[PDB]
Every structure is written in structure tokens, then in C-alpha cells.
């Protein structure tokens, strides 16, 4: 028995309690929502679903009937990536991605690799992305490792107020080569 995930679109009326709980767990601190209220998390979810294009929004992943993670596929043009001067070069079909794992601590081997493979296959083959774009905090080493595991390449670092973001790209072609079409890690 290994991880195989499915996902669906978020449903704020019934996922809010879970998502808010996950955002309060110290391991989630890079989401910067540790002290958020339910209303704050409701706004986060609703804002993530407000693009005109239905491909964007938050999704919830499942295994054995239980919630496992949240992911956001977002429009790079309404994100910090598109601030003037970041160095991001937008391409049609770019999709930004964020991942939030659940607050559960008991995992089978290779949890986050299976999570990442599922997310990336969803972005490319269900949401039509030609490239996934991310810009985590440079200090978030765990995310750097996850990115490298599925073929992301670092493009550069750029400043945001008080922080440094590390811009990375994963083209559909680099994902396919690195992971054998989404089957295994680089």
C-alpha cells in the first residue's frame, strides 16, 4: 500500500474547519496564517476562487476517504510574481502553485513526493498548464527540495518587503523528463 491521491475543488462550507486547523499548525508557518480566524481563512479561499478563469482555485486531496492536503493553482498575473521588476516573464498557460499539507503527523513513506506528483499532473493535464511557476521564501528549504524532486529549475531570487523569494519554473517537458511522465521523482 502506497499513496495514490484524488482531488476535488474546495468547498468552503465544509472544508473551512479543516483548512483553518491546518494553517494553525507550526509546520504550516510559511503560509503566514498561524493566528488567522475562520473568517480570514474563508476570505483566503474565496479570493483564491475569484479569478474569471475556472482553471484556478484551491483543491483538496484525498486518500482512503480522508483529506490529505490543499493545493492552489493560481493566476500568476494577479500574484506577487507579476509585481513590476520581479524578473518573472509570463507565458500563456503559466499556472502558479501553493501546497498546504494537513496537520496530521502520521505518514507512510514518500508522502510529499506523491503529493507533488499528483499536483503537478493535475496542473499540466487537467488544468492545461504549460508551465508551473512558484516563488517560495528562499529560506523554505523543504519546498526547494520538493520542487527539485519534480523538475523545477531555479530562475533567480527577487526581493519582496522583508523577504527574498526564489522564482522557479517547471515546464511540462521538464516534468515529463524528470519524473517519467509523473510516475517517480527525479
C-alpha atoms as an extended CHARMM CRD file, in Angstrom:
* protein
*
       186  EXT
         1         1  UNK       CA              0.0000000000        0.0000000000        0.0000000000  PROA      1               0.0000000000
         2         2  UNK       CA              1.4270000000        3.3260000000       -1.1820000000  PROA      2               0.0000000000
         3         3  UNK       CA             -0.1550000000        6.7270000000       -1.6700000000  PROA      3               0.0000000000
         4         4  UNK       CA             -2.4500000000        7.3440000000       -4.6200000000  PROA      4               0.0000000000
         5         5  UNK       CA             -4.4440000000       10.5590000000       -4.4250000000  PROA      5               0.0000000000
         6         6  UNK       CA             -7.5150000000       12.0530000000       -5.9570000000  PROA      6               0.0000000000
         7         7  UNK       CA             -8.5430000000       15.6820000000       -5.6170000000  PROA      7               0.0000000000
         8         8  UNK       CA            -11.6090000000       17.8550000000       -5.9590000000  PROA      8               0.0000000000
         9         9  UNK       CA            -12.3880000000       21.5390000000       -5.8860000000  PROA      9               0.0000000000
        10        10  UNK       CA            -12.5260000000       23.1040000000       -2.4500000000  PROA      10              0.0000000000
        11        11  UNK       CA            -15.9500000000       23.5570000000       -0.8010000000  PROA      11              0.0000000000
        12        12  UNK       CA            -15.6880000000       26.3830000000        1.7100000000  PROA      12              0.0000000000
        13        13  UNK       CA            -18.8850000000       25.4110000000        3.5400000000  PROA      13              0.0000000000
        14        14  UNK       CA            -17.3770000000       22.1140000000        4.6280000000  PROA      14              0.0000000000
        15        15  UNK       CA            -13.5820000000       22.3790000000        4.1820000000  PROA      15              0.0000000000
        16        16  UNK       CA            -13.1230000000       25.6040000000        6.1660000000  PROA      16              0.0000000000
        17        17  UNK       CA            -12.6860000000       23.9930000000        9.5930000000  PROA      17              0.0000000000
        18        18  UNK       CA            -10.0080000000       21.6170000000        8.2770000000  PROA      18              0.0000000000
        19        19  UNK       CA             -8.0860000000       24.2200000000        6.3030000000  PROA      19              0.0000000000
        20        20  UNK       CA             -8.1180000000       26.6640000000        9.1950000000  PROA      20              0.0000000000
        21        21  UNK       CA             -6.8100000000       23.9230000000       11.5040000000  PROA      21              0.0000000000
        22        22  UNK       CA             -4.0020000000       23.0630000000        9.0910000000  PROA      22              0.0000000000
        23        23  UNK       CA             -2.9750000000       26.7150000000        8.7290000000  PROA      23              0.0000000000
        24        24  UNK       CA             -2.6030000000       26.9040000000       12.5160000000  PROA      24              0.0000000000
        25        25  UNK       CA             -0.0940000000       24.1000000000       12.7600000000  PROA      25              0.0000000000
        26        26  UNK       CA              3.5160000000       25.2840000000       13.2180000000  PROA      26              0.0000000000
        27        27  UNK       CA              4.6670000000       23.1900000000       10.2660000000  PROA      27              0.0000000000
        28        28  UNK       CA              2.4710000000       25.4700000000        8.0660000000  PROA      28              0.0000000000
        29        29  UNK       CA              4.1680000000       28.6720000000        9.2120000000  PROA      29              0.0000000000
        30        30  UNK       CA              5.2860000000       29.7220000000        5.6990000000  PROA      30              0.0000000000
        31        31  UNK       CA              1.5840000000       30.2460000000        4.8380000000  PROA      31              0.0000000000
        32        32  UNK       CA              1.6930000000       33.1270000000        7.3580000000  PROA      32              0.0000000000
        33        33  UNK       CA             -1.7760000000       32.2860000000        8.7310000000  PROA      33              0.0000000000
        34        34  UNK       CA             -0.9150000000       30.7800000000       12.1240000000  PROA      34              0.0000000000
        35        35  UNK       CA             -3.1960000000       33.1520000000       14.0760000000  PROA      35              0.0000000000
        36        36  UNK       CA             -5.9160000000       33.5350000000       11.4640000000  PROA      36              0.0000000000
        37        37  UNK       CA             -9.6250000000       33.4360000000       12.2050000000  PROA      37              0.0000000000
        38        38  UNK       CA            -12.2060000000       31.3140000000       10.4200000000  PROA      38              0.0000000000
        39        39  UNK       CA            -13.3680000000       34.4240000000        8.5780000000  PROA      39              0.0000000000
        40        40  UNK       CA             -9.7920000000       35.1550000000        7.4960000000  PROA      40              0.0000000000
        41        41  UNK       CA             -9.4340000000       31.6700000000        6.0240000000  PROA      41              0.0000000000
        42        42  UNK       CA            -12.8550000000       31.9240000000        4.3620000000  PROA      42              0.0000000000
        43        43  UNK       CA            -11.6390000000       35.0920000000        2.6300000000  PROA      43              0.0000000000
        44        44  UNK       CA             -8.3850000000       33.3830000000        1.5990000000  PROA      44              0.0000000000
        45        45  UNK       CA            -10.3520000000       30.5540000000       -0.0370000000  PROA      45              0.0000000000
        46        46  UNK       CA            -12.9390000000       32.8100000000       -1.6780000000  PROA      46              0.0000000000
        47        47  UNK       CA            -10.2260000000       35.1320000000       -3.0430000000  PROA      47              0.0000000000
        48        48  UNK       CA             -8.3720000000       32.1080000000       -4.4420000000  PROA      48              0.0000000000
        49        49  UNK       CA            -11.5490000000       31.1500000000       -6.3140000000  PROA      49              0.0000000000
        50        50  UNK       CA            -12.3640000000       34.5670000000       -7.7400000000  PROA      50              0.0000000000
        51        51  UNK       CA            -10.3640000000       34.5760000000      -10.9790000000  PROA      51              0.0000000000
        52        52  UNK       CA            -12.5500000000       34.7010000000      -14.1030000000  PROA      52              0.0000000000
        53        53  UNK       CA            -10.9200000000       31.5010000000      -15.4100000000  PROA      53              0.0000000000
        54        54  UNK       CA            -12.2580000000       28.2530000000      -13.8610000000  PROA      54              0.0000000000
        55        55  UNK       CA             -8.8730000000       26.5160000000      -14.0490000000  PROA      55              0.0000000000
        56        56  UNK       CA             -7.6920000000       28.4790000000      -10.9990000000  PROA      56              0.0000000000
        57        57  UNK       CA             -8.6480000000       27.9170000000       -7.3720000000  PROA      57              0.0000000000
        58        58  UNK       CA             -7.9860000000       25.7030000000       -4.4240000000  PROA      58              0.0000000000
        59        59  UNK       CA             -8.3510000000       21.9070000000       -4.4380000000  PROA      59              0.0000000000
        60        60  UNK       CA             -8.3980000000       19.2840000000       -1.6640000000  PROA      60              0.0000000000
        61        61  UNK       CA             -6.5700000000       15.9660000000       -1.9950000000  PROA      61              0.0000000000
        62        62  UNK       CA             -7.9170000000       12.6710000000       -0.6520000000  PROA      62              0.0000000000
        63        63  UNK       CA             -6.5980000000        9.2250000000        0.2300000000  PROA      63              0.0000000000
        64        64  UNK       CA             -8.6610000000        6.4370000000        1.8360000000  PROA      64              0.0000000000
        65        65  UNK       CA            -11.5590000000        8.8600000000        2.2610000000  PROA      65              0.0000000000
        66        66  UNK       CA             -9.5910000000       11.3780000000        4.3130000000  PROA      66              0.0000000000
        67        67  UNK       CA             -8.3330000000       14.8460000000        3.4850000000  PROA      67              0.0000000000
        68        68  UNK       CA             -4.5780000000       14.9040000000        2.9350000000  PROA      68              0.0000000000
        69        69  UNK       CA             -3.6020000000       18.3550000000        1.6060000000  PROA      69              0.0000000000
        70        70  UNK       CA             -4.7930000000       21.5270000000       -0.0650000000  PROA      70              0.0000000000
        71        71  UNK       CA             -3.3000000000       22.9740000000       -3.2060000000  PROA      71              0.0000000000
        72        72  UNK       CA             -3.8850000000       26.2470000000       -5.0100000000  PROA      72              0.0000000000
        73        73  UNK       CA             -3.4660000000       26.6840000000       -8.7560000000  PROA      73              0.0000000000
        74        74  UNK       CA             -3.3640000000       30.4460000000       -9.1330000000  PROA      74              0.0000000000
        75        75  UNK       CA             -3.1700000000       33.0460000000      -11.8740000000  PROA      75              0.0000000000
        76        76  UNK       CA              0.3920000000       34.4110000000      -11.9210000000  PROA      76              0.0000000000
        77        77  UNK       CA             -0.8890000000       37.7650000000      -13.2460000000  PROA      77              0.0000000000
        78        78  UNK       CA             -2.8100000000       38.5150000000      -10.0030000000  PROA      78              0.0000000000
        79        79  UNK       CA              0.0040000000       37.3500000000       -7.7370000000  PROA      79              0.0000000000
        80        80  UNK       CA              3.1770000000       38.8290000000       -6.3270000000  PROA      80              0.0000000000
        81        81  UNK       CA              5.0200000000       37.2560000000       -9.2830000000  PROA      81              0.0000000000
        82        82  UNK       CA              3.6190000000       39.9330000000      -11.5490000000  PROA      82              0.0000000000
        83        83  UNK       CA              4.7740000000       42.9040000000       -9.4930000000  PROA      83              0.0000000000
        84        84  UNK       CA              6.9380000000       45.1550000000      -11.7180000000  PROA      84              0.0000000000
        85        85  UNK       CA             10.5850000000       44.2000000000      -11.7240000000  PROA      85              0.0000000000
        86        86  UNK       CA             10.4850000000       40.6980000000      -10.2320000000  PROA      86              0.0000000000
        87        87  UNK       CA             12.0290000000       39.2010000000      -13.3630000000  PROA      87              0.0000000000
        88        88  UNK       CA              9.0930000000       36.8540000000      -13.9520000000  PROA      88              0.0000000000
        89        89  UNK       CA              8.3940000000       36.5120000000      -17.6830000000  PROA      89              0.0000000000
        90        90  UNK       CA              4.7520000000       35.4910000000      -18.0820000000  PROA      90              0.0000000000
        91        91  UNK       CA              3.8900000000       32.8610000000      -20.6880000000  PROA      91              0.0000000000
        92        92  UNK       CA              0.3850000000       31.8780000000      -21.7500000000  PROA      92              0.0000000000
        93        93  UNK       CA             -0.5150000000       28.7360000000      -19.8570000000  PROA      93              0.0000000000
        94        94  UNK       CA              1.5770000000       29.5070000000      -16.7780000000  PROA      94              0.0000000000
        95        95  UNK       CA             -0.0370000000       28.4220000000      -13.5150000000  PROA      95              0.0000000000
        96        96  UNK       CA              1.2150000000       29.2740000000      -10.0400000000  PROA      96              0.0000000000
        97        97  UNK       CA              1.1020000000       26.6560000000       -7.2900000000  PROA      97              0.0000000000
        98        98  UNK       CA              0.9290000000       26.5570000000       -3.5000000000  PROA      98              0.0000000000
        99        99  UNK       CA              0.7330000000       23.4360000000       -1.3160000000  PROA      99              0.0000000000
       100       100  UNK       CA             -0.5680000000       23.0830000000        2.2460000000  PROA      100             0.0000000000
       101       101  UNK       CA             -0.2740000000       19.6430000000        3.8470000000  PROA      101             0.0000000000
       102       102  UNK       CA             -2.7160000000       18.5650000000        6.5240000000  PROA      102             0.0000000000
       103       103  UNK       CA             -1.7900000000       18.8340000000       10.1930000000  PROA      103             0.0000000000
       104       104  UNK       CA             -1.7210000000       15.0300000000       10.5780000000  PROA      104             0.0000000000
       105       105  UNK       CA              1.7210000000       13.7900000000       11.5460000000  PROA      105             0.0000000000
       106       106  UNK       CA              1.3780000000       10.0700000000       10.7300000000  PROA      106             0.0000000000
       107       107  UNK       CA              2.5060000000        9.3860000000        7.1520000000  PROA      107             0.0000000000
       108       108  UNK       CA              3.5740000000        6.4580000000        5.0100000000  PROA      108             0.0000000000
       109       109  UNK       CA              6.8730000000        6.7010000000        3.1030000000  PROA      109             0.0000000000
       110       110  UNK       CA              7.1360000000        9.2570000000        0.3220000000  PROA      110             0.0000000000
       111       111  UNK       CA              4.0340000000       11.2810000000        1.2220000000  PROA      111             0.0000000000
       112       112  UNK       CA              5.1320000000       14.6560000000       -0.1160000000  PROA      112             0.0000000000
       113       113  UNK       CA              6.5860000000       13.1870000000       -3.3120000000  PROA      113             0.0000000000
       114       114  UNK       CA              3.2880000000       11.5060000000       -4.1030000000  PROA      114             0.0000000000
       115       115  UNK       CA              1.5070000000       14.7720000000       -3.2370000000  PROA      115             0.0000000000
       116       116  UNK       CA              3.7080000000       16.7700000000       -5.5600000000  PROA      116             0.0000000000
       117       117  UNK       CA              3.3420000000       14.2980000000       -8.4330000000  PROA      117             0.0000000000
       118       118  UNK       CA             -0.4340000000       14.4340000000       -8.1020000000  PROA      118             0.0000000000
       119       119  UNK       CA             -0.4850000000       18.2450000000       -8.0240000000  PROA      119             0.0000000000
       120       120  UNK       CA              1.7770000000       18.5800000000      -10.9840000000  PROA      120             0.0000000000
       121       121  UNK       CA             -0.1290000000       16.0480000000      -13.1080000000  PROA      121             0.0000000000
       122       122  UNK       CA             -3.3100000000       17.9310000000      -12.1960000000  PROA      122             0.0000000000
       123       123  UNK       CA             -1.8130000000       21.2770000000      -13.2300000000  PROA      123             0.0000000000
       124       124  UNK       CA             -0.4950000000       20.0650000000      -16.5790000000  PROA      124             0.0000000000
       125       125  UNK       CA             -3.1130000000       17.5200000000      -17.6260000000  PROA      125             0.0000000000
       126       126  UNK       CA             -6.3550000000       18.6980000000      -16.0410000000  PROA      126             0.0000000000
       127       127  UNK       CA             -5.7990000000       22.4580000000      -15.7900000000  PROA      127             0.0000000000
       128       128  UNK       CA             -3.9120000000       22.7610000000      -19.0780000000  PROA      128             0.0000000000
       129       129  UNK       CA             -0.7590000000       24.3870000000      -17.7340000000  PROA      129             0.0000000000
       130       130  UNK       CA              2.2790000000       24.5150000000      -19.9730000000  PROA      130             0.0000000000
       131       131  UNK       CA              4.4870000000       25.6010000000      -17.0460000000  PROA      131             0.0000000000
       132       132  UNK       CA              4.1120000000       25.7470000000      -13.2600000000  PROA      132             0.0000000000
       133       133  UNK       CA              5.6300000000       28.7780000000      -11.5300000000  PROA      133             0.0000000000
       134       134  UNK       CA              6.4790000000       29.0870000000       -7.8180000000  PROA      134             0.0000000000
       135       135  UNK       CA              8.2650000000       31.6860000000       -5.6960000000  PROA      135             0.0000000000
       136       136  UNK       CA              8.6500000000       30.4380000000       -2.1150000000  PROA      136             0.0000000000
       137       137  UNK       CA             10.7130000000       32.1460000000        0.5360000000  PROA      137             0.0000000000
       138       138  UNK       CA             14.3920000000       31.3970000000       -0.1100000000  PROA      138             0.0000000000
       139       139  UNK       CA             14.6440000000       30.0820000000        3.4600000000  PROA      139             0.0000000000
       140       140  UNK       CA             11.9800000000       27.4090000000        2.8640000000  PROA      140             0.0000000000
       141       141  UNK       CA             14.3780000000       24.5810000000        2.1130000000  PROA      141             0.0000000000
       142       142  UNK       CA             11.7260000000       21.8600000000        2.2980000000  PROA      142             0.0000000000
       143       143  UNK       CA              9.8660000000       23.3830000000       -0.6470000000  PROA      143             0.0000000000
       144       144  UNK       CA             13.0990000000       23.7340000000       -2.6150000000  PROA      144             0.0000000000
       145       145  UNK       CA             13.6590000000       20.0080000000       -2.2240000000  PROA      145             0.0000000000
       146       146  UNK       CA             10.0950000000       19.1750000000       -3.2780000000  PROA      146             0.0000000000
       147       147  UNK       CA             10.4820000000       21.4250000000       -6.3170000000  PROA      147             0.0000000000
       148       148  UNK       CA             13.7250000000       19.7870000000       -7.4030000000  PROA      148             0.0000000000
       149       149  UNK       CA             12.1380000000       16.3450000000       -6.9770000000  PROA      149             0.0000000000
       150       150  UNK       CA              9.7140000000       17.0650000000       -9.8350000000  PROA      150             0.0000000000
       151       151  UNK       CA             11.9760000000       19.0220000000      -12.1760000000  PROA      151             0.0000000000
       152       152  UNK       CA             11.6850000000       22.6880000000      -11.2460000000  PROA      152             0.0000000000
       153       153  UNK       CA             14.6240000000       24.8680000000      -12.2140000000  PROA      153             0.0000000000
       154       154  UNK       CA             15.5590000000       27.9950000000      -10.2630000000  PROA      154             0.0000000000
       155       155  UNK       CA             15.3320000000       31.1740000000      -12.3490000000  PROA      155             0.0000000000
       156       156  UNK       CA             16.5180000000       33.6510000000       -9.7330000000  PROA      156             0.0000000000
       157       157  UNK       CA             15.7880000000       35.3770000000       -6.4720000000  PROA      157             0.0000000000
       158       158  UNK       CA             13.8420000000       38.5960000000       -6.1870000000  PROA      158             0.0000000000
       159       159  UNK       CA             13.0530000000       40.8730000000       -3.2480000000  PROA      159             0.0000000000
       160       160  UNK       CA              9.7030000000       41.3460000000       -1.6050000000  PROA      160             0.0000000000
       161       161  UNK       CA              9.2610000000       43.5170000000        1.5080000000  PROA      161             0.0000000000
       162       162  UNK       CA             11.4190000000       41.9580000000        4.2240000000  PROA      162             0.0000000000
       163       163  UNK       CA             11.8750000000       38.6560000000        2.3680000000  PROA      163             0.0000000000
       164       164  UNK       CA             13.5770000000       37.0680000000       -0.6090000000  PROA      164             0.0000000000
       165       165  UNK       CA             11.5660000000       34.8650000000       -2.9730000000  PROA      165             0.0000000000
       166       166  UNK       CA             13.1510000000       32.1570000000       -5.1350000000  PROA      166             0.0000000000
       167       167  UNK       CA             11.4580000000       32.0460000000       -8.5390000000  PROA      167             0.0000000000
       168       168  UNK       CA             11.3850000000       28.5600000000      -10.0690000000  PROA      168             0.0000000000
       169       169  UNK       CA              9.7680000000       27.1260000000      -13.1740000000  PROA      169             0.0000000000
       170       170  UNK       CA              8.6820000000       23.6120000000      -14.1680000000  PROA      170             0.0000000000
       171       171  UNK       CA              7.8070000000       23.2170000000      -17.8300000000  PROA      171             0.0000000000
       172       172  UNK       CA              5.6210000000       20.3290000000      -18.8830000000  PROA      172             0.0000000000
       173       173  UNK       CA              8.6100000000       18.9220000000      -20.7850000000  PROA      173             0.0000000000
       174       174  UNK       CA             10.9730000000       19.1720000000      -17.8270000000  PROA      174             0.0000000000
       175       175  UNK       CA              8.4010000000       17.4870000000      -15.5810000000  PROA      175             0.0000000000
       176       176  UNK       CA              7.9340000000       14.6240000000      -18.0470000000  PROA      176             0.0000000000
       177       177  UNK       CA             11.6820000000       14.0740000000      -18.3760000000  PROA      177             0.0000000000
       178       178  UNK       CA             12.4570000000       14.3870000000      -14.6570000000  PROA      178             0.0000000000
       179       179  UNK       CA              9.6190000000       12.1810000000      -13.3780000000  PROA      179             0.0000000000
       180       180  UNK       CA              8.9330000000        9.7470000000      -16.2580000000  PROA      180             0.0000000000
       181       181  UNK       CA              5.6290000000       11.4950000000      -17.0500000000  PROA      181             0.0000000000
       182       182  UNK       CA              4.6410000000       11.9120000000      -13.3930000000  PROA      182             0.0000000000
       183       183  UNK       CA              5.4390000000        8.4020000000      -12.1300000000  PROA      183             0.0000000000
       184       184  UNK       CA              8.5440000000        8.8700000000       -9.9720000000  PROA      184             0.0000000000
       185       185  UNK       CA             10.7780000000       11.5450000000       -8.5320000000  PROA      185             0.0000000000
       186       186  UNK       CA             13.8520000000       12.9430000000      -10.2680000000  PROA      186             0.0000000000
